């Protein structure tokens, strides 16, 4: 079977360069072109270029000509893409694909950031004092200003999990922000303890917040 | 210059037939644009479907077929299955480069539709002490997984300082999202009413919080 195995995730600082690999298996590597594609949040999918592995000739979209350099190693049947003068706008998921309507690699997540390791600040999300009581109550925890990803939020050492909703992170002001919520019966809070535990292994830090009525 | 446009979102049911289109801003789409179609499933999983207008990739179910309809490229799913719920992109060739469409979110109803549960939280006293203020609007348990979120302060539509996550699938196969309104401490204390408006299936629900007197 065909396999397009890309190299792993990479974090670099602005101005550096990175070389992403794509190891082809299960077919004649030099018998097919190889494409490269970028997926970003603000620009969606963009075609970088393609390379003829037999001749080694690359072709680029005009806007990537000075950003990317495509090469191959015929001996290992691996295609390479080197990105130059990296900026934060180059942060994205990069794919190799033998053909756009066929086999794709699994993607390589590239993060370009000057930010340093930063623990999260955890803030409680609770209803206001003037809130109206209902059969249930929704609580949460705001996790702001951490880097790099990711965090793992746990509520009451895992006893609450069915009613948990943990949301994706967003990049804001060079740092990451996410939030998590849990819904419990009104008869359980504040009568009983509800705590969110936010683990951030990169900073070797964990922060627990006990939810209290505002 | 050449911009490719697809439908933002489409909904169908299991066993029905649905058609996705792909149009070019510069002119009609023809076989000279070699339309390719690719499917994205959650966690950046791309699977090619159609190459060269209508050549189905090996292993792709026969219910997927490509064609040209008028001046547009089309992907037709005859007898959609629940596992076809995904994002579908088209790519067109323009002489010397490819251009992707923005993608179409396809819902294949695997369960009854569900309205969103909306909860708006105020800035915590802890954050206000940092000279910052963030309002959080959590949205859960909506299906199909497409929503629009609008913020209003003192009745004025907000255009800056707000960001929303892309809908993410829940364990029960419904979707969830969260929206944030990032403000300065002074901005928070300088306005009265704050609102999060979430529209789903053309229905708008509202949650508001006003600074008590």
């Amino acid at each position: 079977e065909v396999q397009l195995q890309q190299s792993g995730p990479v974090l670099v600082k602005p101005g550096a360069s990175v070389k992403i690999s794509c190891k082809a298996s299960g077919y004649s590597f030099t018998g097919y072109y190889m494409h490269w594609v970028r997926q970003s949040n603000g620009k969606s999918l963009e075609w970088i270029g393609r390379i003829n592995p037999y001749t080694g000739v690359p072709s680029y979209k005009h806007n990537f000509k000075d950003k990317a350099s495509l090469t191959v190693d015929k001996s290992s049947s691996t295609a390479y893409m080197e990105l130059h003068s990296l900026t934060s706008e180059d942060s994205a998921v990069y794919y190799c694909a033998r053909e756009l309507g066929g086999y794709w690699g699994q993607g390589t997540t590239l993060t370009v950031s000057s930010a340093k390791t930063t623990p999260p600040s955890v803030y409680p999300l609770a209803p206001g004092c003037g809130d109206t009581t209902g059969s249930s109550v929704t609580l949460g925890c705001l996790v702001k200003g951490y880097f790099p990803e990711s965090v793992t939020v746990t509520w009451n050492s895992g006893s609450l999990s069915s009613s948990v909703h943990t949301f994706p992170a967003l990049l804001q002001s060079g740092l990451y922000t996410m939030s998590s919520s849990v819904t419990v019966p009104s008869s359980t809070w504040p009568s009983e303890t509800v705590t969110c535990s936010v683990a951030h292994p990169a900073s070797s830090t964990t922060v627990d917040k006990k939810l209290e009525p505002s | 210059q050449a911009v490719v446009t697809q439908e933002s979102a489409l909904t169908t049911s299991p066993g029905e037939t649905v058609t996705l289109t792909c149009r070019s801003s510069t002119g009609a789409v023809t076989t000279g644009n070699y339309p390719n179609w690719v499917q994205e499933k959650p966690d950046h999983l791309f699977t090619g479907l159609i190459a060269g207008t209508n050549n189905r990739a090996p292993g792709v179910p026969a219910r997927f077929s490509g064609s040209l309809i008028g001046d547009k490229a089309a992907l037709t799913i005859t007898g959609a299955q629940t596992e076809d719920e995904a994002i579908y992109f088209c790519a067109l060739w323009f002489s010397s480069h490819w251009v992707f469409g923005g993608g179409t979110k396809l819902t294949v109803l695997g369960q009854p539709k569900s309205s969103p549960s909306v909860t708006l939280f105020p800035p915590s006293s802890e954050e206000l002490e940092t000279n910052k203020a963030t309002l959080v609007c959590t949205i859960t348990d909506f299906y199909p997984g497409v929503v629009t979120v609008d913020w209003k302060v003192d009745g004025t539509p907000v255009t800056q300082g707000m960001e929303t996550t892309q809908p993410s699938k829940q364990s029960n196969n419904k979707y969830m999202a969260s929206s944030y309104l990032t403000l300065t401490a002074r901005a928070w204390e300088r306005h009265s009413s704050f609102s999060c408006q979430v529209t789903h299936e053309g229905h708008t629900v509202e949650k508001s919080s006003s600074r008590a007197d």
Binding site: G31, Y32, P53, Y54, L100 | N36, A51, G52, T53, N54
Partner: peptide, 15 residues
């Protein structure tokens, strides 16, 4: 003749 390198992205449509 020679070594043919394919780009399946650019197949001609079937008819």
């Amino acid at each position: 003749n020679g070594y043919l390198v394919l780009d399946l992205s650019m197949q001609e449509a079937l008819s």
